Amino acid sequence: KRDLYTQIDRLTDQRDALREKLSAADNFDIQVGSRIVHDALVGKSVVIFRTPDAHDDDIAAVSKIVGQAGGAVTATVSLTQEFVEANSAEKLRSVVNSSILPAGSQLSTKLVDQGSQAGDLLGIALLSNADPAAPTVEQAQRDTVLAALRETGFITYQPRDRIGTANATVVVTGGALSTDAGNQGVSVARFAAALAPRGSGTLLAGRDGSANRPAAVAVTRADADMAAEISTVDDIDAEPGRITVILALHDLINGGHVGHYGTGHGAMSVTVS
Amino acid sequence: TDTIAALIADVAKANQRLQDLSDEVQAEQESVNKAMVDVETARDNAAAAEDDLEVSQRAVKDANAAIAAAQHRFDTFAASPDEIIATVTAAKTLSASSQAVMANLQRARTERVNTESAARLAKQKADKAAADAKASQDAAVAALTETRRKFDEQREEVQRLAAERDAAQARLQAARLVAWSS
């Protein structure tokens, strides 16, 4: 068609109509969010991990929906830039492989990268093993692991005292990574995968663009081992993505079913069935 | 009420209590001896658990040093135009091998840390059993001295009563003779 003016007006009117429908669709989801996740996490606790590129509003939305599900958030641990860049790998492993490991607790000896080892030790400190034979970590023992990782600049956490044990975990990232920040994808994907066996399930949640390499969600989906260990959400920036974090966390705690959700590359569906 | 038959029966009841306290002193002395032995075995176990911990701590110290020594070779190796192209070519050729050497040393180090972790828990359990053994030896020693003081108290009461019975029997035989002589 060579009617360029009438094409611009028609396309502007189509785009504006879809924007209105989309605002209403997102408002529908906010208003029924508590109905969707009703009793999804009753009696259960979640520990939240967040990366430097994660958005405050996503963490707050996940934490609000956890509460709507009848669940509690034990703490929000921020993984510092010193951890995710992976340039302090040996300093990290010298802290993890020290007497800070609670007495009698055993570190995994399979993967020795700093991401896997940090998630393994923080899984011991902050999560409850689905296996009753595994040790129950004391409050003083958990605080020791946390203070050592905070003095060495790997983590930041709220609240600073009396953090309880959690059933499951969410690791929240931002969107797409710049190629120069590619180390952050692998370190956080391995970090998230090592938390999976230490509790009742880990979900790795990212904003739009996280399903593209080199982001953690994409690194997870492309690695057969990690894609089988943790669940992922690639659109935590949107309300359907935030609701799916809780619905897929429910699936992990009750049955251990792993899925890859959202609108991006490698997502098997938008949400759980 | 003040008859010699009643006084004799009073000595017999007091002496039965004294016999019972003597029997408790002997039984509690055996408990102190048994507890004394339990303390020495628990203290030996705690000293053996400290040796297992020291051995595992040394092994951790060695594993950490082997990682540091591998990193020192890789760092010193990295440290002229055609010579610098050759250093980079050699380092890039051996890169994946250096990673595999390091992964092997890191895994070995975690395995030593896990052995030390188990040993730390065994040392804490052995110390708790040694402290619980001492708590029992102390509770048995204190119970023995309490029965020993009740025994000493009863032995003096039995001596007092037997001295009265002996004096009354001596007075009875003397009074019988003064009456019999008249």
> Is residue B61 within a helix (H) or strand (E), and if so which, with residue range?
helix B4-78
Residues B110/A92, Cβ–Cβ less than 8 Å:
no
Best A106, A108, A113 residue to mutate vs chain B (most B CBs within 10 Å):
A106
**Looking at residue B160, which CATH number applies to its domain?**
1.10.287
Q: Alpha-carbon dihedral of residues A5, A6, A7, A9, nearest 10 degrees? A: 90
Experimental method: X-ray
Resolution of the solved structure (Å): 2.2
Of B64, B67, B113, the CB nearest to A101: B113
| Gap sites in chain B (C to N > 2.5 Å), preceding residue numbers | 79
Question: Is the CB of A109 less than 8 angstroms away from the CB of B107?
Answer: yes
- Contact between A29 and A239 (Cβ < 8 Å): yes
Range of B106's domain? 4-177
**Given CB atoms, is A90 within the 8 Å cutoff of chain B?**
yes
DSSP string, chain A: ---HHHHHHHHHHHHHHHHHHHHHHHHHHHHHHHHHTTTTTTT-EEEEEE-TTS-HHHHHHHHHHHHHTT-EEEEEEEE-HHHHT-SSHHHHHHHHTSTTS-TT-----S--SHHHHHHHHHHHHHB--S-TTS----HHHHHHHHHHHHHTTSEEEESSS-PPPBSEEEEE--SPPPGGGTHHHHHHHHHHHHHGGGSS-EEEE--TTTTSTTSHHHHHHHSHHHHHHSEEES-TTSHHHHHHHHHHHHHHHTT----EESSSTT-SBSS--
In a domain, B182, yes or no: no
| CA gap A236, A174 in Å, rounded | 9
Would B144 be classed as within a structural domain?
yes
Distances in whole angstroms, Cα of residue B67 to Cα of each of A113, A148, B112, B133 = 14, 21, 13, 42
Cβ–Cβ of A107/B113 closer than 8 Å?
yes
- Whether residues A105 and B117 touch (CB distance < 8 A) is answered with yes
Residue A218 CA to residue A209 CA, distance in Å, equals: 9
Number of residues that make up chain B: 182
Is some CB atom of chain B closer than 8 A to the CB atom of A148?
Answer: no
- Nearest one of A187, A186, A194, A271 to A230, comparing CA atoms: A194
Q: What is the 3-state secondary structure (H, E, C) of B5-27?
A: HHHHHHHHHHHHHHHHHHHHHHH
Residues, chain A: 273
State how many domains chain B has.
Answer: 1
Tokens 């979640």 map to which residue? A46
Helix axes B81-93 and B95-180, enclosed angle (nearest 10): 50
The CB density around residue B62, as the number of other CB atoms within 10 Å, is 13
Beta-bridge partner residues of A127: A166
